[PDB]
Motif scaffolding. Structure first.
Motif, PDB file in Angstrom:
ATOM      1  N   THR A 363       0.977  -1.140  -0.038  1.00  0.00           N
ATOM      2  CA  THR A 363       0.139   0.011   0.102  1.00  0.00           C
ATOM      3  C   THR A 363       0.847   1.154  -0.050  1.00  0.00           C
ATOM      4  O   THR A 363       0.346   2.306  -0.527  1.00  0.00           O
ATOM      5  CB  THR A 363      -1.025  -0.078   1.189  1.00  0.00           C
ATOM      6  N   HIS A 364       2.154   1.227   0.303  1.00  0.00           N
ATOM      7  CA  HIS A 364       2.927   2.487   0.595  1.00  0.00           C
ATOM      8  C   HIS A 364       4.382   2.031   0.233  1.00  0.00           C
ATOM      9  O   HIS A 364       5.034   1.007   0.422  1.00  0.00           O
ATOM     10  CB  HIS A 364       3.185   2.733   2.057  1.00  0.00           C
ATOM     11  N   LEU A 365       4.782   2.752  -0.793  1.00  0.00           N
ATOM     12  CA  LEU A 365       5.978   2.801  -1.387  1.00  0.00           C
ATOM     13  C   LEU A 365       6.688   4.012  -1.371  1.00  0.00           C
ATOM     14  O   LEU A 365       6.078   5.331  -1.897  1.00  0.00           O
ATOM     15  CB  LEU A 365       6.133   2.369  -3.017  1.00  0.00           C
ATOM     16  N   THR A 366       7.900   4.261  -0.818  1.00  0.00           N
ATOM     17  CA  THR A 366       8.631   5.291  -0.610  1.00  0.00           C
ATOM     18  C   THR A 366      10.156   5.146  -1.301  1.00  0.00           C
ATOM     19  O   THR A 366      10.846   4.036  -0.837  1.00  0.00           O
ATOM     20  CB  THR A 366       8.846   5.808   0.730  1.00  0.00           C
ATOM     21  N   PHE A 367      10.641   5.914  -2.316  1.00  0.00           N
ATOM     22  CA  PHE A 367      11.808   5.759  -2.717  1.00  0.00           C
ATOM     23  C   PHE A 367      12.942   6.676  -2.233  1.00  0.00           C
ATOM     24  O   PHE A 367      12.622   7.796  -1.779  1.00  0.00           O
ATOM     25  CB  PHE A 367      11.851   5.967  -4.290  1.00  0.00           C
ATOM     26  N   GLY A 368      14.093   6.323  -2.416  1.00  0.00           N
ATOM     27  CA  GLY A 368      15.126   7.137  -2.113  1.00  0.00           C
ATOM     28  C   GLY A 368      15.619   8.229  -2.790  1.00  0.00           C
ATOM     29  O   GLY A 368      14.778   8.459  -3.628  1.00  0.00           O
ATOM     30  N   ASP A 369      16.800   8.865  -2.398  1.00  0.00           N
ATOM     31  CA  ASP A 369      17.301   9.738  -3.232  1.00  0.00           C
ATOM     32  C   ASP A 369      17.631   9.319  -4.943  1.00  0.00           C
ATOM     33  O   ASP A 369      16.949   9.906  -5.794  1.00  0.00           O
ATOM     34  CB  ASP A 369      18.643  10.430  -2.713  1.00  0.00           C
ATOM     35  N   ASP A 370      18.391   8.394  -4.844  1.00  0.00           N
ATOM     36  CA  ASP A 370      19.097   7.992  -6.120  1.00  0.00           C
ATOM     37  C   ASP A 370      18.130   7.314  -7.215  1.00  0.00           C
ATOM     38  O   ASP A 370      18.409   7.486  -8.302  1.00  0.00           O
ATOM     39  CB  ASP A 370      20.349   7.383  -5.721  1.00  0.00           C
ATOM     40  N   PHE A 371      17.073   6.842  -6.840  1.00  0.00           N
ATOM     41  CA  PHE A 371      16.146   5.908  -7.517  1.00  0.00           C
ATOM     42  C   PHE A 371      15.882   6.601  -8.670  1.00  0.00           C
ATOM     43  O   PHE A 371      14.910   7.441  -8.550  1.00  0.00           O
ATOM     44  CB  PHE A 371      14.892   5.446  -6.773  1.00  0.00           C
ATOM     45  N   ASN A 372      15.931   5.816  -9.949  1.00  0.00           N
ATOM     46  CA  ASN A 372      15.855   6.673 -11.432  1.00  0.00           C
ATOM     47  C   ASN A 372      15.975   5.456 -12.390  1.00  0.00           C
ATOM     48  O   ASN A 372      16.592   5.812 -13.437  1.00  0.00           O
ATOM     49  CB  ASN A 372      16.995   7.581 -11.489  1.00  0.00           C
ATOM     50  N   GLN A 373      15.085   4.474 -12.222  1.00  0.00           N
ATOM     51  CA  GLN A 373      14.757   3.416 -13.170  1.00  0.00           C
ATOM     52  C   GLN A 373      13.317   3.541 -13.845  1.00  0.00           C
ATOM     53  O   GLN A 373      12.417   3.744 -12.950  1.00  0.00           O
ATOM     54  CB  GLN A 373      15.048   2.158 -12.746  1.00  0.00           C
ATOM     55  N   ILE A 374      12.982   3.290 -14.976  1.00  0.00           N
ATOM     56  CA  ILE A 374      11.779   3.299 -15.697  1.00  0.00           C
ATOM     57  C   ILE A 374      10.707   2.365 -14.833  1.00  0.00           C
ATOM     58  O   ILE A 374      11.279   1.352 -14.530  1.00  0.00           O
ATOM     59  CB  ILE A 374      11.993   2.537 -17.168  1.00  0.00           C
ATOM     60  N   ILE A 375       9.554   2.692 -14.730  1.00  0.00           N
ATOM     61  CA  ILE A 375       8.578   1.923 -14.121  1.00  0.00           C
ATOM     62  C   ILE A 375       7.482   1.636 -15.206  1.00  0.00           C
ATOM     63  O   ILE A 375       6.924   2.777 -15.622  1.00  0.00           O
ATOM     64  CB  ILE A 375       7.838   2.530 -12.965  1.00  0.00           C
ATOM     65  N   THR A 376       7.408   0.418 -15.617  1.00  0.00           N
ATOM     66  CA  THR A 376       6.420   0.256 -16.777  1.00  0.00           C
ATOM     67  C   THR A 376       5.094  -0.399 -16.144  1.00  0.00           C
ATOM     68  O   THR A 376       5.204  -0.338 -14.944  1.00  0.00           O
ATOM     69  CB  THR A 376       6.996  -0.803 -17.617  1.00  0.00           C
ATOM     70  N   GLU A 377       4.213  -0.752 -17.081  1.00  0.00           N
ATOM     71  CA  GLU A 377       2.585  -1.245 -16.570  1.00  0.00           C
ATOM     72  C   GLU A 377       2.877  -2.595 -15.770  1.00  0.00           C
ATOM     73  O   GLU A 377       4.033  -3.312 -16.066  1.00  0.00           O
ATOM     74  CB  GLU A 377       2.035  -1.371 -17.994  1.00  0.00           C
ATOM     75  N   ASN A 378       1.964  -2.809 -14.967  1.00  0.00           N
ATOM     76  CA  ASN A 378       1.842  -4.147 -14.296  1.00  0.00           C
ATOM     77  C   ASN A 378       3.111  -4.421 -13.362  1.00  0.00           C
ATOM     78  O   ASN A 378       3.731  -5.546 -13.200  1.00  0.00           O
ATOM     79  CB  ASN A 378       1.625  -5.156 -14.971  1.00  0.00           C
ATOM     80  N   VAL A 379       3.917  -3.007 -12.917  1.00  0.00           N
ATOM     81  CA  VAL A 379       5.029  -3.104 -12.094  1.00  0.00           C
ATOM     82  C   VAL A 379       4.748  -2.880 -10.583  1.00  0.00           C
ATOM     83  O   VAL A 379       5.064  -3.556  -9.799  1.00  0.00           O
ATOM     84  CB  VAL A 379       6.046  -2.224 -12.382  1.00  0.00           C
TER      85      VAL A 379
END
Length: 679
Positions: A363-379
């Protein structure tokens, strides 16, 4: 040199220091059980405290150091500060009814038989105390014992009361604690900074539930040392000793390591009863397969942890996983459990996250500073309601990427990709763009559910008719946002509007909606306000730095209750320009203009002048309901009693002008309270 009374707690001034001889009547109020004193108070209090008070709190800052031998004999609690010594005569004379005591920091004499009150339950030694304690000295019914900074004397058997439940050592204590020394009643034991002795078998009692070691403690814990009552173990900074099998009890629910701990953990060492691990900073060891307990609900790594998490390492009980600053290992498909609802990454995390990697409970997703990867459909999971991207994330967001279920989306600093028709979910409630976001926002892109929308520093694009959703209540525009708002753009449920630093464009009539109650101008806005601009529902109007435009009749609406002019507003205000409805008016730093009769609404209760207001106050100018008059530093004008309203409760003035301000005021017979402020 005045007192402030709360529900039961009379607090004096922090520079009070007046003999208590003329305060008896005040302290004789039968609804006050306690007294707070502050820093400068150093006056006798022996025969000057009535029977109704049960607590004297002196607060740690106090300069009080007088002989006290006659409290009340009805006290249950007294706490002393930094400058208090005692003779034992004085200790023998604290009243027989007393339950809770903290001694002065200066006290460092040796206590002997039958001195501290027999019936006492709470005892707290001062900073400087470092005197020996023998068998029948501490009251036998004592439940709470705290030692201060300097105490480092030995503790031997039959000395600690067998009623004791909480025992907390201070920084300097570093003496051996042996068998039968600690009471069989003890539930909390907390060591401080310097403590560094072995703990062997039968030293901790079987009633102990909480154990906290401190900075320097770095001794090994072997089999059968920690009791099976224990639920809470917190190691401190230097503990770095390997923890093997059958040392942690099977009743343990909480476990926290300190910075230095960096040892391997094998199978059948972490008890299956554990729901919480917090790891230390330096911890960076491989967590292998059936190591973590099965009842685990919260797992938190440290800042140095950076070791690969492989299949079936985490339990299927786990609900919260927080990573640290270093963690930057690839996460593959059956790694996170199907119970996991919360995920927080750290500063370094920057690995790809593919199709079935994140669980369907999340239910909850927090990314860090550096996180910078493509997020596609059904991920992203279709259970997710909360998504916060960090600083460096600036990848494209495609159509069916963000889940149906999403309610909270926070985009980061660097985020500046375009947002088109079906990117943001229908259902989204909060949306917060970060600093760099400056792409056009056209119609049917923001969803019809959205209530809160906030933009960042850089966002300065046009917002045209029917872009903003119908169910929008809250809109915050950012630094650079300096585009005109037109007739049918701001929706009909918007109550809150904050305009940004740069926003300095004129507002025409049917623009700000009739649901808007709260309006905030930023630094630059300096455009004139005319008739039927401001809505007839508006209650809160806050002007920014540079707004210095004169206001005329029928401009501020007849619902307005809070008005606050900013620094640079310094324009005359005449008759029936301030609304009937007004209760809180706040002048800004530079406002220096005469006030005649019939100008400030009679209904007004709080009035504040800023720095530079220094004009006479003639009779029948100040509102008839006024209760709180606050003047600024430079206000240097006599006040008389007949020019102050009969309802005034509090008058705030600068200290250094008082004898000029109250020259024509007999302060010995005012019905209001003078508050001063200083430089």
């Amino acid at each position: 040199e005045k007192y402030t009374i709360k529900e039961t707690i009379l607090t004096f001034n922090n520079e009070f220091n007046d003999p208590l001889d003329k305060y008896y009547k005040i302290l004789s109020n039968p609804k006050i059980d306690t007294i707070e004193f502050g820093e400068k108070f150093n006056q006798e209090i022996d025969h000057l405290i009535p029977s109704n008070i049960k607590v004297i709190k002196f607060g740690w800052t106090s300069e009080f150091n007088k002989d006290v031998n006659f409290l009340t004999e009805s006290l249950t609690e007294i706490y002393y500060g930094i400058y208090k010594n005692h003779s034992l005569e004085e200790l023998q004379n604290l009243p027989k009814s007393l339950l809770k005591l903290k001694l002065g920091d200066v006290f460092n004499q040796e206590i002997v038989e039958n001195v501290l009150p027999g019936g006492l339950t709470h005892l707290t030694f001062g900073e400087e105390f470092n005197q020996k304690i023998v068998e029948n000295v501490l009251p036998g019914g004592l439940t709470h014992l705290t030692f201060g900074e300097e105490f480092n004397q030995k503790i031997v058997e039959n000395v600690l009361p067998n009623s004791l439940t909480h025992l907390s050592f201070g920084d300097c204590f570093n003496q051996k604690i042996t068998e039968n020394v600690l009471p069989n009643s003890l539930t909390y034991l907390e060591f401080g900074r310097n403590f560094n002795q072995k703990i062997t078998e039968n030293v901790l009692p079987n009633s102990l539930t909480h154990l906290t070691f401190g900075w320097y403690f770095n001794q090994q814990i072997t089999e059968n040392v920690l009791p099976n009552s224990l639920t809470y173990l917190e190691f401190g900074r230097n503990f770095n000793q390997q923890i093997t099998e059958n040392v942690l009890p099977n009743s343990l629910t909480y476990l926290e390591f300190g910075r230095n701990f960096n040892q391997q953990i094998t199978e059948n060492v972490l008890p299956n009863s554990l729901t919480h691990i917090t790891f230390g900073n330096n911890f960076n060891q491989i967590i292998t397969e059936n190591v973590l307990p099965n009842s685990l609900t919260h797992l938190t790594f440290g800042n140095n942890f950076n070791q690969i998490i492989t299949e079936n390492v985490l339990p299927n009980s786990l609900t919260h996983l927080t990573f640290g600053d270093d963690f930057n290992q690839i996460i593959t498909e059956n790694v996170l459990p199907n119970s996991l609802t919360h995920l927080t990454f750290g500063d370094d995390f920057n690995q790809i996250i593919t199709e079935n990697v994140l669980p369907n409970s999340l239910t909850h997703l927090t990314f860090g500073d550096d996180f910078n990867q493509i997020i596609t459909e059904n991920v992203l999971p279709n259970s997710l309601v909360h998504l916060s991207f960090g600083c460096e994330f600036n990848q494209e967001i495609a159509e069916k990427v963000l889940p149906n279920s999403l309610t909270y989306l926070e985009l980061g600093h660097n985020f500046n990709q375009k947002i088109i028709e079906n990117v943001l979910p229908n259902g989204l409630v909060h949306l917060s763009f970060g600093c760099k976001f400056n792409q056009e926002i056209v119609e049917n892109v923001l969803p019809d559910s959205l209530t809160h929308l906030s933009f960042g520093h850089c966002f300065n694009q046009k917002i045209t008719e029917n872009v903003l959703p119908n169910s929008l209540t809250y809109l915050e525009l950012g630094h650079n946002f300096n585009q005109k708002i037109i007739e049918n753009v701001l929706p009909d449920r918007l109550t809150y509007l904050e305009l940004g630093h740069d926003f300095n464009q004129k507002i025409m009539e049917n623009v700000l909606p009739n649901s808007l109650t709260h309006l905030i101008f930023g630094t630059s806005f300096n455009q004139n306000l005319t008739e039927n601009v401001l809505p007839n529902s508006l209650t809160h109007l806050t002007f920014g730095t540079c707004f210095n435009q004169k206001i005329i009749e029928n401009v501020l609406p007849n619902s307005l209750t809070h008005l606050e002019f900013g620094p640079k507003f310094n324009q005359k205000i005449t008759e029936n320009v301030l609304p009937n409805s007004l209760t809180h008016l706040t002048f800004g730093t530079s406002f220096n203009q005469k006030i005649t009769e019939n100008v400030l609404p009679n209904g007004l209760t709080y009035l504040t002048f800023g720095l530079r207001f220094n004009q006479k106050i003639t009779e029948n100018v100040l509102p008839c309901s006024l209760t709180h008059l606050t003047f600024g530093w430079y206000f240097n004008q006599e006040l008389t009693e007949n020019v102050l309203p009969d309802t005034l409760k509090v008058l705030k003035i600068y200290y250094g002008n008082k004898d000029i301000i109250l020259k024509n005021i007999d302060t010995s017979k005012i019905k209001f309270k003078i508050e001063y402020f200083n430089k």
